[PDB]
């Protein structure tokens, strides 16, 4: 039959006896009204994970089979609401009023169903858009130590997506609830919430919901994706999903591994991250996109969970604390951060203006290390060392201040083409702001051409505009 009884209860994990027709991955309902998922099926005991408060479930309570595989609610009504991993409203404001459901154990789009990613995701941060580009459907990893600015680079991205017909999801895994309310109030102030969905799994919840939260978040976005509209997803910590599985598993009694992690860490992370894709024109040309996070103890790139996730994603953005304390913000180590799709995800102007930049900011980093040990140097090295410093300045940018792409290409054109050399280093950050003002009042034609064509205007005209401003600017 379809009824059983709980025999062991502890630490959120339960075993039941009976329930003969259950499937792996089913939903099961206890008497208290708390729901559960079957993950193991021995000859005499079914192994069930509780998805709610377990302080009311006693031995000898009944448990009954729903008949459904694990399903997350989807629909247009979820947009602008704060929700649980299960489809349950949290912000107050009443029901979510969804229409249909999707499995959380979907198959990924296969080979022969995908296209090369061929369209930008303009974040509005100079270093990311110029050096480490992202295109719709390319997975990109933000990895850094605690308190280095990682959350900011994500929130700034959602805010600078208002014009495009984008839908964004923020999944908060393991975060203290006060912080999530702070993020939501921040989005509401910048007007971002109108096109976003927030999914919350606070540190007080049983680890099973922490484990389900990322899957629920992609399950919600793929609905839009197969319908054609483009989507972006952010996972606030995948390193807290890993910790949560380790408890869910060590508890289940599955033996340990490297550290105490199971071996199925790579499967878990692959299952989630491979549902991100750019579908082809036959499928209607949608896109999912993903931004997972990973925190590393002592700021180390070489470790078990960091290298597993660095193996799956289509690039990485590594943020360093020692750069952060030395005045470079947002601090991105250019030597350790590379993008696999870089070059296809840019407007034609940015490809031409800024192609050798990621390597360039790497030769300066090495030539700085050697010359701190070289005493006197020659002319070709004194010239080049200067460019890297001029570049590290131009790459700096404060919090909650977006720069449009047309302005990024023009300041990088001074930087790559080299008219910027005359200005002392200390005045470079200031020179930028005055240049943006001058460009808005006078140079509407050059920006018009960039918005119109996605290409660079005639060199003589650009040289004329920039040389003329170099008359107006005043310097030390």
């Amino acid at each position: 039959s379809d009824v059983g009884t709980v025999i062991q209860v502890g630490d959120g994990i339960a075993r039941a006896h009976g329930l003969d027709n259950v499937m792996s991955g089913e939903l099961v309902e206890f008497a208290n009204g708390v729901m559960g998922m079957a993950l193991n099926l021995e000859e005499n005991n079914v192994g069930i994970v509780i998805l709610g408060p377990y302080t009311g479930i006693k031995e000898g309570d009944e448990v009954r089979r729903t008949g459904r595989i694990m399903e997350v609610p989807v629909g247009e009504a979820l947009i602008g609401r704060v929700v649980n991993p299960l489809g349950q409203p949290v912000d107050g404001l009443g029901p979510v009023e969804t229409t249909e459901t999707r499995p959380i154990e979907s198959r990924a789009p296969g080979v022969m169903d995908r296209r090369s990613v061929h369209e930008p995701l303009q974040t509005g941060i100079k270093a990311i858009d110029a050096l480490v580009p992202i295109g719709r459907g390319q997975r990109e990893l933000i990895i850094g130590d605690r308190q280095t600015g990682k959350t900011s680079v994500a929130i700034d991205t959602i805010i600078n997506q208002k014009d495009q017909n984008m839908i964004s999801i923020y999944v908060a895994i393991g975060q203290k609830e006060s912080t999530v309310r702070t993020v939501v109030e921040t989005l509401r102030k910048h007007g971002a919430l109108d096109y976003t969905i927030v999914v919350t799994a606070s540190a007080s919840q049983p680890a099973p919901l922490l484990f389900l939260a990322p899957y629920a978040g992609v399950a919600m976005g793929e609905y839009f994706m197969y319908k054609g509209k483009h989507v972006l997803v952010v996972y606030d910590d995948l390193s807290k999903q890993a910790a949560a599985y380790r408890e869910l598993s060590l508890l289940l009694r599955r033996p340990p591994g490297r550290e105490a992690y199971p071996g199925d860490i790579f499967y878990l992370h692959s299952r989630l991250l491979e549902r991100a894709a750019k579908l082809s024109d036959a499928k209607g040309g949608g896109s999912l996109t993903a931004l997972p996070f990973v925190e590393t103890q002592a700021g180390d790139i070489s470790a078990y969970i960091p290298t597993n996730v660095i193996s799956i994603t289509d690039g990485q953005i590594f943020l360093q604390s020692d750069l952060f304390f030395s005045g470079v913000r947002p601090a991105i180590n250019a030597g350790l951060s590379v993008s696999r799709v870089g070059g296809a995800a840019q407007i034609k102007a940015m490809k031409k203006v800024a192609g050798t930049l990621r390597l360039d900011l790497a030769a300066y980093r090495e030539l700085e290390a050697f010359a701190q040990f070289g005493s006197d140097l020659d002319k070709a090295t004194q010239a080049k060392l200067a460019r890297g410093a001029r570049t590290v300045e131009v790459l700096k940018q404060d919090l909650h201040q977006p720069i449009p792409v047309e302005k990024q290409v023009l300041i990088i054109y001074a930087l790559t083409r080299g008219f910027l050399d005359d200005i002392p280093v200390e005045d470079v950050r200031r020179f930028e702001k005055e240049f943006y003002l001058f460009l808005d009042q006078n140079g509407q034609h050059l920006l018009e051409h960039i918005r119109t064509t996605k290409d660079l205007p005639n060199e003589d005209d650009l040289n004329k505009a920039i040389e003329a401003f170099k008359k107006t600017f005043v310097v030390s």
């Binding site: 209860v9 006693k58 000898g60 308190q147 408890e247 508890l251 103890q297």
Partner: protein, 471 residues
């Protein structure tokens, strides 16, 4: 029935068989009261808390007092509820154990006074309130580099004997006099000498009338030490919600809550992970620390001391707790031995309030600029360790001179240090603290010697301390 029997005893852990169909809930409390019926046997009073359902009508229970004397077959009564702690105005001025009983020898709490449970669910998203204003402690290093926040969590990390309790006593002295509100002091794993010492400090001050104290100490069985933090917080939660008063909650060592769980978790039959820690570390810590929050009704500010197990920060317990804290100061043993008191790491300590908006632009350019000078000094640590300062050139020489000035000018004279060094203490207001750093950074005090910059309050004090030397 409600009566159940003991079946196994295993240090802290005990196993209780119940009648079919009448088992206790998963955090419910039980009673053993036994009178010796023969010379061989001994008499007992004990209470136990349910922790797992083991099958075969068996519930596994952690204990709240020593299980010596337990004879298999000792009978058990069922309270029907979690451990219930007396709450209301009657708590003020009193000293308590985990069971809720008064240990102060001033009487016993009237049986009709309302007692609420220890284990209650955490506060909802709709209720929580987020705001920022700055709390002023008069301690130089906190006020510039990592400022504390009203209504937040404040965490003090450090290894064995590195200065956690003295900084807590200086915070109590300045803040609880100025607070105008309720305080709770909760001691988990606190050296007993301190408990006799403080009770006397609070009575002599007259501050006792507005505060309540829970103690469970290094001598007590492991079970009692876990539940003591939860006990202190149910009293504090009544003061924030129903009285509506603002509250301070002080915890003496929060590390012992995880450590006590580590010992009992292994005997409960769970498997172990990482460096021997339990398989439920994140969830157990988070369940306690999410309750400690500011709300629309009122605010709690909590000051916590974290013992690092060895001088190892990467160890699983200290690092799981870092995420839940708003402002953090990390004391370092190597500085303590140089003579820098308090021994705060200037570059490792972080707080959400060093934002140009919250602390203001002036307090901001100055804070980051201090960090930039100090970080360069760490890079130059491993060169100057061998050759000395002949290898250094130009900017390297000027940077090391100013770093030496800064690192000694972050050290202070405390009123609580008077019991160790004969000097009087100093309180430095924030406007003075920010102003002082600027003149050191500009180079206006380049001439004065480094030994004049130690254990002083406001900047002027350095000029008179130099003039005493004449160097």
């Amino acid at each position: 029935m409600t009566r159940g029997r003991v079946i196994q005893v295993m240090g802290p852990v005990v196993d209780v068989k119940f009648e079919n169909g009448h088992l206790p809930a998963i955090y419910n409390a039980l009673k053993i009261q036994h009178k010796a019926r023969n010379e061989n046997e001994v008499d007992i009073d004990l209470t136990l808390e349910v922790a797992l359902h083991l099958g075969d009508d068996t519930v596994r229970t952690i204990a709240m007092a020593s299980t010596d004397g337990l004879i298999r077959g000792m009978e058990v009564i069922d309270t029907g509820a979690p451990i219930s702690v007396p709450v209301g105005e009657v708590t003020l001025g009193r000293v308590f154990n985990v069971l809720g009983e008064p240990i102060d020898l001033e009487g016993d709490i009237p049986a009709d006074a309302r007692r609420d449970p220890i284990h209650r669910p955490a506060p909802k998203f709709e209720e929580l309130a987020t705001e920022v204003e700055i709390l002023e402690t008069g301690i130089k290093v906190v006020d510039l580099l990592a400022p504390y926040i009203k209504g937040g969590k404040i965490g003090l990390f450090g290894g064995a004997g590195v200065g956690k309790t003295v900084l807590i006593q200086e915070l109590i002295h300045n803040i609880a006099q100025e607070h105008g509100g309720i305080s709770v002091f909760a001691g988990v794993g606190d050296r007993t000498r301190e408990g006799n010492d403080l009770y006397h400090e609070m009575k002599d001050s007259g501050v006792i009338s507005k505060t309540a104290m829970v103690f469970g100490q290094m001598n007590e069985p492991p079970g009692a030490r876990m539940r003591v933090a939860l006990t202190g917080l149910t009293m504090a939660e009544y003061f924030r919600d129903e009285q509506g008063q603002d509250v301070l909650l002080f915890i003496d060592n929060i590390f012992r809550f995880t450590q006590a769980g580590s010992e009992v978790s292994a005997l409960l039959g769970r498997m172990p992970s990482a460096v021997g820690y339990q398989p439920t570390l994140a969830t157990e810590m988070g369940q306690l620390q999410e309750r400690i929050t500011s709300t629309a009704k009122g605010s709690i500010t909590s000051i916590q001391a974290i013992y690092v197990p060895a001088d190892d920060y990467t160890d699983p317990a200290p690092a799981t707790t870092f995420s839940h804290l708003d402002a953090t100061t990390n004391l370092e043993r190597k500085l303590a031995e140089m003579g820098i008191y308090p021994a705060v790491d200037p570059l490792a300590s972080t707080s959400r309030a060093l934002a140009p908006e919250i602390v203001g632009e002036e307090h901001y350019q100055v804070a980051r600029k201090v960090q930039q000078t100090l970080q360069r000094y760490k890079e130059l640590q491993d060169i100057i360790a061998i050759l000395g300062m002949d290898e250094l050139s130009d900017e390297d020489k000027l940077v090391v001179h100013r770093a030496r000035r800064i690192q000694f000018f972050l050290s202070q004279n405390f009123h609580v240090a008077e019991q160790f060094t004969g000097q009087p203490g100093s309180y430095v207001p924030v406007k003075e603290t920010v102003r002082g750093f600027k003149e050191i950074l500009e180079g206006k005090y380049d001439h004065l010697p480094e030994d004049a910059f130690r254990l002083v309050g406001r900047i002027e004090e350095v000029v008179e301390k130099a003039k005493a030397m004449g160097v």
